[PDB]
Design a protein around this ligand. Structure first.
Ligand SMILES: Nc1ncnc2c1ncn2[C@@H]1O[C@H](COP(=O)(O)OP(=O)(O)OP(=O)(O)O)[C@@H](O)[C@H]1O
Ligand SMILES: Nc1nc(O)c2nc(CNc3ccc(C(=O)O)cc3)cnc2n1
Ligand SMILES: Nc1nc(O)c2nc(CNc3ccc(C(=O)O)cc3)cnc2n1
Ligand SMILES: Nc1ncnc2c1ncn2[C@@H]1O[C@H](COP(=O)(O)O)[C@@H](O)[C@H]1O
Ligand SMILES: [Ca+2]
Ligand SMILES: [Ca+2]
Ligand SMILES: [Mg+2]
Ligand SMILES: [Mg+2]
Ligand SMILES: [Mg+2]
Lengths: 548, 571
């Protein structure tokens, strides 16, 4: 009943590990892609963590064998099997032989004790899987591992099952037989010489995985995705287990474990440590001739911007509608000239890790599709938090690429914004709103660690409400936070040729908010005045660097 | 009486000066200082001013002279005072001394008897050490009472008088005995309508004063001046009693006793609460303002315009100077410092006075500070009421006599003391410190002690670490990293446009801009460290930054944070 024709939908929790800091993202993201291709749908992910307890991949992705199972990108609002899995409601009897608590505890404990005798990059995922059983799932997992010619993908959970199968002998053609049930094996190029590897790689099978409740890096991840979840073989919920291990660490060793184990977010393709640097995002409001616009982009890189945010649709208050030129026509050419002039890499080839991350400020599906088709951008800055056209969420995943996104809170539009100002609980309403939005992308397979939050200063907030959101920015301490205060009316509201005076004050007032952001450890600030902001951040950094 | 026997002596007495008139605290209290300086002896120590929670302008003209002479002369040490601090041998008290127990019982009695009468507003407080020619406390109390009367408001208590231990239960004096004691010290001559109020006033005499150990405000002040002093009557040094009080209020009533017991500094004539506001001090360097054209003439009209621009831009203080003290290129010719600053300051005084407008701006007038080390320049400014503050980058080392101009018959001026070594050509190589942070701090505390010994009020003295003066770039940073060591003191700093900001960075007006912006970073940092005064060129930019940071800090409900949080978790 192992290769039962009775196709099912099960819930599996995986753990993905690599050891290589420089390639972690590509490595783990490659694994993510091969999970979505080969196992089912990703419907949850944790953050990426650095824990302390080359490029054949690019052309692996070309030469993949087709799955025998379909991919479906339609947005879902809800997933019933997941609700069921979280709740410990009823599912179909395991096809693999279970063990009771007592035996699991012993046979688990046994494996730990017996095991008694660098950097690690961790990530968990929930998969709604069409694979029948954990052992099969492992087979496929071992395929994926061997494909990536470096990666350790463990099965943390698989429904409410408890399984300790003690010795596993799998015939060389059963392994082929299993894979074929789920993959259009080309019978890399040749699957023959992969099988013989996997022959010995499955010794036993423990569900839950042995270390689930014993490795910090595991509980850290699971705490992100499924904090209220209580498996049968656990004293308490993930949260409690997580909390207990954190506070307990302070007693046994006075350790404060968060310090070793750093949360990560990703803007393009490298690690960023949450709360460890205030990146500048320079604004390019194209509203300006391509060549000119591109000079500005170059000015900005050199003035110290990590990110350029280009937009051709003005989202500021009461701004004028003018039918003359389309958002596409403004932004796409500019990005194309940029990518051209950058690619003239006769200049130092080492200065291509100088390349700015490119962000496009749009809600328009058509604009983003062209940008992504033509590799012109890295990030979607969607000021509707992807609510205006959620189809846009499907553009954040390619076969072998993930894009990051900024989710901003607003109400209404440029004309109505200033009216839509009532909030029962301003700070938490908005936070809860961004959490609801993040949950939505995450259910739809956007990596949690590629999603950035923005409270949308000046968008359906009075000026006191904008200040109040800054005063309470601490509520974002756990999240990658992106803000834009630059040149907004609320700065000027704070102050004791009239219009030139006011401009300067407003720019200088923004540098105060650069200072505040720096101390609040805001991850990105969206600014017009890049040289000024960089000067501020450089000085505050020196004042912090306390080495002799 | 041995009391009136003209056996002329020097005694050490420690006084308390208290008022409750908020708006005039400075005036009331400094006037009292003046009368104590004239009629009692020499002021050789002062505390800070503190806000605690439990016709004068004319009167100064018509004051009877003193039978004792006043020396404005500077001293380096004061042996009597040294002797008072260690409790070395001093002449027996002419008044009868009680013993510890007896003393202790009578105070306890006064403390309890007073509880009930009250068991049936803010204060402004200041202590002072006086080296006195009065022979005993009762005489001093008599003169003190005269001073009070003369002022019509004020409460001047004696807290110590050498090592003596006195309690004198019942006191009436003939209006005759009074006139005699008064006549001993003051040239008397109406005085009579004064003398009659005084008869009943002196119910008793307690030395040390009854409340010395019970009122936080008194220990608070004394801890500024004589931390290490132990009286026979006291269980421990003033420092220890002070710390124990703070700590007991914390442990036992869960109160932070400091929170409504605020240290004050004075820039001109108004109360400033230490650490409550970062004031902008706008720079007017006439030398620069005038010879950067490449020109050769002083333009005083242009200079005064700049002063008005700065006032509108939000400067609270204007620092004017003629000598260039920066490291760079000197275009100083025949035209003197005096000629650079005094004309400008005089046109400013005229222009401010010929305010065509109604005197709406009367209370919005900037404090004027002069960046000089020069006795003559300062004297001219002070004699013609052109300046308020001496800004002395030598910490009064170039000419200590300049300290005597901070004081007048009825005026006190505030002073900035700054640390440097050498001069503009020399200073960049004068960079070896055994302990950078503490050497500079100790230096300034020694200058403060010197000025305080010479009766400059403690709360009028401001410290400046002197960024970029005999400091490498990394040392300038290190002084900012360690600015907390100034948490007890009025702190004035000067980072504006100095080389060390640029070195923090990675056409050529790019540097200028990077520098001005990098400075706004330090305004930010100064804001959070609660620096009292920052000396800046770019007033408008600095004011924007402070305005916005002040706004972000102004919260409506201080518990809203955790409340709204809870509201949200309850859904
Ligand atoms: N050391 C002292 N200094 C000043 N006055 C003293 C002292 N010892 C006794 N007295 C006198 O005894 C009385 C009590 O001293 P205290 O300073 O408490 O009085 P007070 O401040 O005038 O009274 P209150 O402020 O409680 O109305 C005063 O009338 C004062 O003349
Ligand atoms: N993610 C993100 N975050 C922003 O803050 C933002 N702001 C604008 C500019 N929009 C505004 C809004 C309000 C105001 C005013 O009150 O002045 C001005 C400009 C454009 N894209 C943005 N994208
Ligand atoms: N009280 C006070 N505090 C200062 O800091 C100050 N600075 C100057 C200007 N002097 C300098 C010194 C160093 C530097 C450089 O390294 O660039 C520049 C200018 C003039 N008066 C001053 N007065
Ligand atoms: N749930 C599981 N997930 C992955 N490997 C497992 C699991 N249970 C047992 N193993 C086996 O344990 C061995 C070492 O991997 P690990 O236990 O993940 O360190 C391999 O032979 C795995 O096949
Ligand atoms: Ca899939
Ligand atoms: Ca005198
Ligand atoms: Mg292993
Ligand atoms: Mg493993
Ligand atoms: Mg009194």
């Amino acid at each position: 009943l192992i290769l039962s024709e009775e196709n099912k939908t099960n819930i599996a929790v995986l753990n993905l590990g690599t050891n290589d800091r420089r390639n972690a993202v590509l490595i783990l993201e490659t694994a993510l892609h091969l999970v979505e291709k080969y196992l089912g749908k990703i419907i949850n992910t944790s953050y990426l963590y650095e824990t302390v307890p080359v490029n054949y991949i690019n052309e692996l992705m070309q030469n993949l064998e087709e799955s025998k199972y379909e991919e479906n990108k339609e947005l879902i609002d809800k997933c019933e099997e997941y609700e069921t899995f979280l709740k410990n409601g009823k599912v179909d009897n395991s096809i693999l032989k279970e063990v009771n608590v007592e035996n699991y505890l012993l046979e688990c404990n046994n494996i730990i004790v017996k095991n008694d005798e660098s950097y690690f990059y961790n990530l968990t995922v929930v998969v709604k899987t069409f694979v029948n059983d954990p052992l099969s799932m492992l087979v496929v997992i071992k395929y994926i591992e061997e494909l990536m010619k470096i990666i350790d993908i463990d099965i943390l959970f698989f429904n409410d099952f408890t399984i300790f199968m003690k010795n596993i002998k799998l015939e060389k053609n059963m392994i082929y037989k299993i894979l074929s049930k789920y993959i259009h094996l080309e019978r890399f190029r040749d699957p023959q010489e992969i099988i013989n590897n996997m022959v010995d790689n499955i010794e036993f099978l423990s569900i839950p995985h042995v270390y689930t409740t014993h490795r910090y890096s595991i509980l850290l991840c699971l705490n992100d995705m499924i904090p209220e979840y209580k498996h049968n073989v656990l004293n308490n919920t993930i949260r409690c287990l997580y909390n207990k291990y954190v506070s307990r660490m302070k007693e046994q060793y006075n350790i404060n474990i968060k310090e070793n184990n750093k949360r990560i977010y990703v803007l393009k393709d490298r690690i960023s440590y949450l709360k460890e640097k205030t990146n500048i995002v320079g604004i390019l409001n194209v509203n300006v001739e391509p060549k000119r616009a591109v000079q500005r982009m170059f000015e900005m890189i050199n003035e110290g911007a990590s990110v350029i945010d280009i937009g051709g649709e003005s989202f500021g208050p009461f701004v004028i509608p003018n039918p003359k030129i389309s958002e596409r026509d403004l932004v796409v050419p500019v990005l194309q000239l940029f990518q051209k002039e950058w690619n003239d890499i006769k200049n130092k080839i080492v200065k291509c890790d100088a390349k700015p991350i490119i962000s496009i400020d749009t809600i328009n599906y058509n604009v983003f599709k062209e940008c992504v088709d033509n590799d012109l951008v890295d990030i979607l800055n969607d000021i509707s938090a992807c609510t205006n056209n959620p189809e846009i969420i499907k553009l954040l995943k390619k076969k072998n690429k993930f894009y990051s996104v900024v989710l901003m809170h607003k109400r209404g539009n440029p004309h109505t914004m200033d009216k839509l100002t009532n909030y029962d609980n301003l700070v938490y309403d908005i936070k809860n709103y961004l959490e609801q939005r993040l949950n939505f992308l995450v259910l739809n397979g956007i990596p949690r660690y590629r999603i950035l939050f923005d409270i949308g200063l000046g968008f359906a907030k009075k000026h006191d409400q904008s200040i109040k959101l800054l005063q309470n920015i601490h509520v974002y301490d756990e999240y990658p936070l992106f803000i834009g205060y630059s040149r907004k009316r609320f700065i000027t509201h704070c102050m004791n040729d009239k219009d030139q005076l006011l401009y300067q004050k407003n720019i200088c007032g923004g540098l105060a908010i650069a200072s505040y952001s720096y101390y609040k450890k805001v991850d990105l600030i969206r600014v017009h005045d890049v040289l000024e902001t960089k000067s501020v951040l450089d000085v505050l950094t020196k004042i912090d660097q306390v080495k002799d």
